[PDB]
Each structure stands twice: as C-alpha cells, then as structure tokens.
Amino acid sequence: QYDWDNVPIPANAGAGKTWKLQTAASDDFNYTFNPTNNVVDFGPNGNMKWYNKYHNRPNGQPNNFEGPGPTKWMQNHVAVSGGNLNIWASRIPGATKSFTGSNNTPISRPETRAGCITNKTRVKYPVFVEARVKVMNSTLASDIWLLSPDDTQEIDIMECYGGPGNDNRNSYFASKIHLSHHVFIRPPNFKDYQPADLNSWWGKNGVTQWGGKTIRIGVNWVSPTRLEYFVDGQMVRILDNDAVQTRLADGTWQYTYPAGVTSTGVNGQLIKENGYQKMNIASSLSDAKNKSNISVIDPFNYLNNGRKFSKEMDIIINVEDQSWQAEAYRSPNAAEMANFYDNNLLVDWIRVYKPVN
Ligand SMILES: [Ca+2]
Numbered sequence: 001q002y003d004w005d006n007v008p009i010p011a012n013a014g015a016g017k018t019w020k021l022q023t024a025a026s027d028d029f030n031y032t033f034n035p036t037n038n039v040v041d042f043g044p045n046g047n048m049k050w051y052n053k054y055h056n057r058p059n060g061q062p063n064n065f066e067g068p069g070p071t072k073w074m075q076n077h078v079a080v081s082g083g084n085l086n087i088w089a090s091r092i093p094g095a096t097k098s099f100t101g102s103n104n105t106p107i108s109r110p111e112t113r114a115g116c117i118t119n120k121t122r123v124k125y126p127v128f129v130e131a132r133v134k135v136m137n138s139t140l141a142s143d144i145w146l147l148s149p150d151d152t153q154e155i156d157i158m159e160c161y162g163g164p165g166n167d168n169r170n171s172y173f174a175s176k177i178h179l180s181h182h183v184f185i186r187p188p189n190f191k192d193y194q195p196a197d198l199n200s201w202w203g204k205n206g207v208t209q210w211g212g213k214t215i216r217i218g219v220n221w222v223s224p225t226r227l228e229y230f231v232d233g234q235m236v237r238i239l240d241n242d243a244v245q246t247r248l249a250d251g252t253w254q255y256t257y258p259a260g261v262t263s264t265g266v267n268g269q270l271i272k273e274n275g276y277q278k279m280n281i282a283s284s285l286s287d288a289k290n291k292s293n294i295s296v297i298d299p300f301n302y303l304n305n306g307r308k309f310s311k312e313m314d315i316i317i318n319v320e321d322q323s324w325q326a327e328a329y330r331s332p333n334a335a336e337m338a339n340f341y342d343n344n345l346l347v348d349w350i351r352v353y354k355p356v357n
Pocket of ligand 1 (some may be wrong): 003028030084314345347348349
C-alpha cells in the first residue's frame with residue numbers, strides 16, 4: 001500500500017495501455033531518515049532510493065556544484081520524518097556568497113544553506129512523475145525537477161517561489177508556478193534556454209500564493225518532443241515540439257506558438273512582448289503546430305540533436321536561492337528566516353509510472 005493508492009493518475013497512458021508503478025523510483029517518505037553532514041544514501045528499510053547531494057557525474061564521480069546564486073547546498077538540510085521528505089533552508093550569521101550578477105560582474109548576498117537530493121533511479125520517456133508537496137511559504141524556489149547526468153537536458157516538474165514575503169516584495173511571483181524545462185550548451189560555450197512565455201508562469205483565479213499550499217504536481221514526459229503538466233489532477237499545460245497549450249487563469253485553454261526569434265541557431269534570441277517571449281494565438285494544438293516554425297523545446301539548437309529530449313534524467317528535489325531573486329533582494333530576510341515552518345519544503349510522496357500495454 002502507498003499514500004497515492006487512492007489518487008487517480010491524471011495523465012493518459014493511451015488506448016490499450018495502463019500505468020505501471022516504477023517501484024524503485026517511487027517513494028511515499030513514511031520512514032525515518034535523520035539528517036547528517038555525511039553524503040549518504042537513504043530510503044525505507046534497506047532500500048537506497050536517494051542520496052542527500054546534487055547529482056553525480058555520468059562517470060559516477062561527485063558533482064560538487066553547490067548551487068545557483070548565493071545558494072550553498074548542504075547534506076544535513078535533508079531528512080525524512082512525519083510522513084514527509086523535509087528539505088529546508090537556513091542562514092549562518094555573517095556568511096555570504098558571491099555570484100555573477102546581471103551586469104556580468106560579481107556581487108555578494110547572504111549565503112542560503114539548502115538541501116538537495118538525487119533519486120538513484122533515472123527516468124526517461126515515456127514516464128510520468130508526480131509529487132504531493134507543500135510549497136514553501138518562502139521567496140526561495142521550491143524545486144522538483146529532472147536533469148540529465150551530463151547537465152545538457154532538463155525537464156522541470158515544479159519551480160515555484162511561493163511566498164510573497166513578509167513585505168510582499170515577491171507577490172508577483174508567489175501566485176505562479178513556473179512550468180518549465182531547460183536545454184544547455186555546456187562550457188565553454190555556455191548557453192541556457194527555458195520557457196519564457198507569459199503562459200509558462202501558470203496560475204489560477206483565487207490563488208494569491210502557492211506558498212504554504214499542498215498541491216499535487218507532475219509531468220508526463222510523453223516523447224522526445226512532448227511534455228504535459230498537471231496540478232491537482234488537472235492537465236494545465238502541453239509543450240509539443242513547436243506549440244504550446246495552457247490553461248488560463250479561468251481554466252480555459254489557450255493555444256499558442258512562438259511569434260519570432262532572431263535565429264534558430266545557437267546565437268538566436270527571443271523576440272519579446274510585454275517582457276515575455278512573444279507568442280501568437282492559434283485555435284487548437286494542431287493549428288499551432290501547423291503555424292509554428294520555431295521549437296518550444298530547443299529554439300536555438302543548443303542540443304544539436306533535432307531539438308528534442310534524448311537523454312535519461314536524474315530526479316532532483318531541492319530548494320534554491322537563485323541569482324535573479326537574490327540580486328533583486330527578493331530572497332528571504334532575517335525576520336522570515338525566524339519562522340522555520342515557512343522555510344521547509346515538505347514532500348508527502350513522489351510517484352513514477354510508465355505506460356505499458
Ligand atoms: Ca508520505
């Protein structure tokens with residue numbers, strides 16, 4: 001028996017097919033794992049389902065990247081207890097961290113210590129991954145995501161800065177969940193693409209903040225070229241090759257596709273409108289796909305692979321103080337950090353299925 005037994009799988013396995021639970025990957029977090037400074041595997045009974053660090057390199061060696069912005073990932077900021085995975089953030093008085101700011105020069109902010117874990121079982125399309133999670137009531141990022149070992153391909157389940165802040169400085173972002181993915185060129189020619197259309201910042205009328213709410217959120221990774229997103233059992237977004245459909249604030253579907261880019265090669269940039277990727281309106285997903293000539297996966301050919309996902313991925317859950325938030329002082333302040341509950345991400349369960357006939 002599992003915590004999710006009574007919860008319908010919202011993704012469609014397809015005609016003639018059903019969903020098969022991926023037992024080793026899935027975890028309903030009902031055991032005890034006490035936090036430790038050591039890098040260790042953890043799980044129920046004898047099982048090793050996770051380790052308390054950012055994901056290893058393809059060769060198995062540690063990846064010692066400590067996080068974006070002024071984040072420092074810390075082994076002992078991860079525990080399992082009370083039926084939940086707990087991943088939290090804290091600060092040490094006087095501790096600071098430098099990172100490259102928006103002017104391509106170093107800047108410093110208070111260092112945010114935070115947990116980060118990686119699942120020992122990788123996933124690849126076709127696969128559905130869903131978690132039940134209490135989003136942190138914090139301006140920090142509550143993250144559940146997938147990343148290839150070589151750091152080139154990424155599919156996010158949740159990236160949410162759910163708390164408006166005690167002074168509401170993060171109110172604009174707190175009402176949204178970023179439904180996202182990334183593709184990268186690795187150094188030396190480092191480039192990063194993620195969805196920047198207005199509709200990728202998903203919300204719902206009557207929800208002012210996600211912080212403190214417990215939601216179910218998942219991604220159905222259908223194929224190299226298709227992702228579907230789900231919140232509380234409802235499909236809310238599809239990315240399909242070169243077109244997008246997303247549920248608007250009132251629940252109604254809008255079909256869109258990219259209006260323009262400067263190039264579809266590696267030095268290309270988005271044409272923007274109102275601060276977001278400029279998108280045109282279509283009348284169905286097929287109409288949008290017909291009209292579009294620009295990938296919504298890899299518009300600038302960073303992967304040089306037919307603009308598609310192609311690599312198995314590690315499941316990562318973490319908290320982050322990202323550079324853009326930290327530079328803008330949207331990161332937590334001392335008063336907010338006095339409330340532990342607000343700074344602790346709780347995952348009740350994460351389940352993984354693949355479609356089988
Ligand atoms: Ca649980």
